[PDB]
Scaffold this active site. Structure first.
Site, short mmCIF file in Angstrom:
data_model
loop_
_atom_site.label_atom_id
_atom_site.label_comp_id
_atom_site.label_asym_id
_atom_site.label_seq_id
_atom_site.Cartn_x
_atom_site.Cartn_y
_atom_site.Cartn_z
N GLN A 95 -6.64 -17.32 -3.23
CA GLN A 95 -6.58 -16.47 -4.45
C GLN A 95 -7.70 -16.88 -5.40
O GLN A 95 -8.31 -15.97 -5.99
CB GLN A 95 -5.25 -16.55 -5.20
CG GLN A 95 -4.17 -15.67 -4.59
CD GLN A 95 -4.52 -14.21 -4.71
OE1 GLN A 95 -4.43 -13.59 -5.77
NE2 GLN A 95 -4.95 -13.65 -3.59
N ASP B 183 -8.07 -0.10 -8.53
CA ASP B 183 -7.46 -0.49 -7.24
C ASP B 183 -7.10 -1.97 -7.27
O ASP B 183 -6.24 -2.32 -6.48
CB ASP B 183 -8.38 -0.14 -6.07
CG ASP B 183 -7.68 -0.28 -4.74
OD1 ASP B 183 -6.45 -0.03 -4.69
OD2 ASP B 183 -8.35 -0.72 -3.79
N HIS C 33 0.83 -1.23 0.00
CA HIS C 33 0.00 0.00 0.00
C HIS C 33 0.86 1.27 0.00
O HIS C 33 0.63 2.19 0.83
CB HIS C 33 -0.97 -0.02 1.19
CG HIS C 33 -2.16 -0.86 0.91
ND1 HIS C 33 -2.33 -2.09 1.47
CD2 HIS C 33 -3.20 -0.66 0.08
CE1 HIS C 33 -3.45 -2.61 1.02
NE2 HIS C 33 -4.00 -1.75 0.17
N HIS D 142 1.93 1.55 -5.63
CA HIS D 142 0.48 1.22 -5.71
C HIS D 142 -0.30 2.44 -6.20
O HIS D 142 -1.06 2.32 -7.14
CB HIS D 142 -0.04 0.72 -4.35
CG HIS D 142 -1.51 0.45 -4.35
ND1 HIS D 142 -2.09 -0.51 -5.15
CD2 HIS D 142 -2.52 1.01 -3.64
CE1 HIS D 142 -3.39 -0.52 -4.94
NE2 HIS D 142 -3.69 0.41 -4.04
N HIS E 46 -5.51 7.74 -3.45
CA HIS E 46 -6.58 6.89 -2.87
C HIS E 46 -6.08 6.23 -1.58
O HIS E 46 -6.94 5.96 -0.70
CB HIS E 46 -7.18 5.90 -3.88
CG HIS E 46 -6.42 4.63 -3.99
ND1 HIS E 46 -5.22 4.55 -4.60
CD2 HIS E 46 -6.70 3.39 -3.56
CE1 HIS E 46 -4.77 3.33 -4.53
NE2 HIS E 46 -5.66 2.59 -3.92
N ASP E 47 -4.78 5.99 -1.44
CA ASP E 47 -4.27 5.23 -0.27
C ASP E 47 -3.31 6.09 0.56
O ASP E 47 -2.53 5.52 1.39
CB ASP E 47 -3.72 3.88 -0.71
CG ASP E 47 -4.72 2.73 -0.72
OD1 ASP E 47 -5.61 2.71 0.14
OD2 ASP E 47 -4.59 1.83 -1.58
C1 LIG Z 1 -11.18 -8.09 1.90
N1 LIG Z 1 -11.16 -9.21 0.95
C2 LIG Z 1 -10.04 -9.52 0.21
O1 LIG Z 1 -9.05 -8.79 0.36
C3 LIG Z 1 -10.02 -10.68 -0.81
C4 LIG Z 1 -9.11 -11.89 -0.58
C5 LIG Z 1 -9.58 -13.15 -0.09
C6 LIG Z 1 -8.68 -14.22 0.09
C7 LIG Z 1 -7.31 -14.03 -0.22
C8 LIG Z 1 -6.83 -12.80 -0.72
C9 LIG Z 1 -7.73 -11.72 -0.90
N2 LIG Z 1 -7.39 -10.45 -1.42
C10 LIG Z 1 -6.40 -10.22 -2.33
O2 LIG Z 1 -5.71 -11.13 -2.75
C11 LIG Z 1 -6.17 -8.86 -2.87
N3 LIG Z 1 -6.80 -7.80 -2.35
C12 LIG Z 1 -6.64 -6.58 -2.80
C13 LIG Z 1 -7.37 -5.42 -2.15
C14 LIG Z 1 -7.67 -5.41 -0.64
C15 LIG Z 1 -8.75 -5.82 -1.67
C16 LIG Z 1 -5.81 -6.34 -3.88
C17 LIG Z 1 -5.14 -7.40 -4.46
C18 LIG Z 1 -5.31 -8.69 -3.98
N4 LIG Z 1 -4.60 -9.77 -4.53
C19 LIG Z 1 -3.50 -9.60 -5.41
C20 LIG Z 1 -2.97 -10.70 -6.14
N5 LIG Z 1 -1.99 -10.45 -6.97
C21 LIG Z 1 -1.51 -9.22 -7.16
N6 LIG Z 1 -1.99 -8.18 -6.52
C22 LIG Z 1 -2.95 -8.33 -5.63
MG LIG Z 2 -7.33 1.34 0.05
ZN LIG Z 3 -5.46 0.79 -3.06
#
Ligand SMILES: CNC(=O)Cc1ccccc1NC(=O)c1nc(C2CC2)ccc1Nc1cncnc1
Ligand SMILES: [Mg+2]
Ligand SMILES: [Zn+2]
EC number: 3.1.4.17
Length: 313
Positions: free
Chosen positions: A269, A217, A68, A72, A106-107
């Site tokens: 994922q 985002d 973050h 980003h 945004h962050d």
């Molecule tokens: C609250 N809910 C969650 O955050 C969902 C979830 C659930 C299970 C596991 C993982 C996640 N989240 C993410 O993986 C993830 N989240 C976010 C933003 C916070 C939303 C951005 C990118 C993500 N992955 C990512 C993969 N590769 C490259 N960049 C980013």
């Molecule tokens: Mg944010």
């Molecule tokens: Zn962000």
């Protein structure tokens, strides 16, 4: 007035593509942004002396956290830049100015912890804002910087264009609270299929911009696999830190955040792509057809995670 930013040929070509990676050189990211503002908005949109001072103040107020961070901020801005260029005529002059800045801001001042961790820690910002906690803090920080002497990049606008652009930016930044993404898409979903979606309805535009912001985002999932794969380490570095800190408060974290449960990531994922990202970019493509490339890459990377589980990498 006459001082175009230009870029190395590869960057000049590759930047117009959704899946562009801004690269490992911090020092170019500010120029990259200004490049995008000039092509997106006009070389007249902002006083360059001022923009540069705002960019550098905004960089100064992102922190050295794994995901973050400043990288980003610019990644998200580029993804918005790509969307605006592929939907040239759909968006007002101010919508183009305010959105790129929103993405950049945004962050602001993120510490790497979720809203949930502020509440359970009883952080003061949770006292001050009970929902969209960090996101109202980021909007708060953006107005702080906008009010420093020599940073009001918006000063040439009228009193009311000014009130519109800050109001665009506020909603824009609240919209990046994934807690609100779910309702916002389901409402856009019903509106596109029942066929009431009206882009002249300002409450409609608000939702559509809300989706774009969620999409921007989330855009590390819309990259070439080797980018998505390595950015996953950074988001997960923050998650496991937050888990460590939940453990310190006497709380078992969700497995997603428990570093003892890395085995469970490729499945986590999978859930993420199916529950969040695929739907996001599906609905965004249905509304803004030229944004299909983001859905393709998302799908590609979903496929790559399936491959990870099957032992195939
Ligand atoms: C609250 N809910 C969650 O955050 C969902 C979830 C659930 C299970 C596991 C993982 C996640 N989240 C993410 O993986 C993830 N989240 C976010 C933003 C916070 C939303 C951005 C990118 C993500 N992955 C990512 C993969 N590769 C490259 N960049 C980013
Ligand atoms: Mg944010
Ligand atoms: Zn962000």
């Amino acid at each position: 007035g006459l001082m175009q930013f230009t870029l190395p040929v590869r960057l000049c070509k590759e930047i117009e593509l959704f899946h562009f990676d801004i690269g490992p050189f911090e020092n170019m990211w500010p120029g990259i942004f200004v490049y995008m503002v000039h092509r997106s908005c006009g070389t007249s949109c902002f006083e360059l002396e001022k923009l540069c001072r705002f960019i550098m103040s905004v960089k100064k107020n992102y922190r050295r956290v794994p995901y973050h961070n400043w990288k980003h901020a610019v990644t998200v801005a580029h993804c918005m830049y790509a969307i605006l260029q592929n939907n040239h005529t759909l968006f007002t002059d101010l919508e183009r100015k305010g959105l790129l800045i929103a993405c950049l801001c945004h962050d602001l001042d993120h510490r790497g912890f979720s809203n949930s961790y502020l509440q359970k820690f009883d952080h003061p910002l949770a006292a001050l804002y009970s929902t969209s906690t960090m996101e109202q803090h980021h909007f708060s920080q953006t107005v702080s910087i906008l009010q420093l002497e020599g940073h009001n990049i918006f000063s040439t606008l009228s009193s009311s264009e000014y009130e519109q652009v800050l109001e665009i930016i506020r909603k824009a930044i609240i919209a990046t609270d994934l807690a609100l993404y779910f309702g916002n898409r389901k409402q856009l979903e019903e509106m596109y299929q029942t066929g009431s979606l009206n882009l002249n309805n300002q409450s409609h535009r608000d939702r559509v911009i809300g989706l774009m912001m969620t999409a921007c985002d989330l855009c590390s999932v819309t990259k070439l696999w080797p980018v998505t794969k390595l950015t996953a380490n950074d988001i997960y570095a923050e998650f496991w830190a937050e888990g460590d800190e939940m453990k310190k408060l006497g709380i078992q974290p969700i497995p997603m955040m428990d570093r003892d449960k890395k085995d469970e990531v490729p499945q986590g994922q999978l859930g993420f792509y199916n529950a969040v990202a695929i739907p996001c970019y599906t609905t965004l493509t249905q509304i803004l057809p030229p944004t299909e490339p983001l859905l393709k890459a998302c799908r590609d990377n979903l496929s790559q995670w399936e491959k990870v589980i099957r032992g195939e990498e």
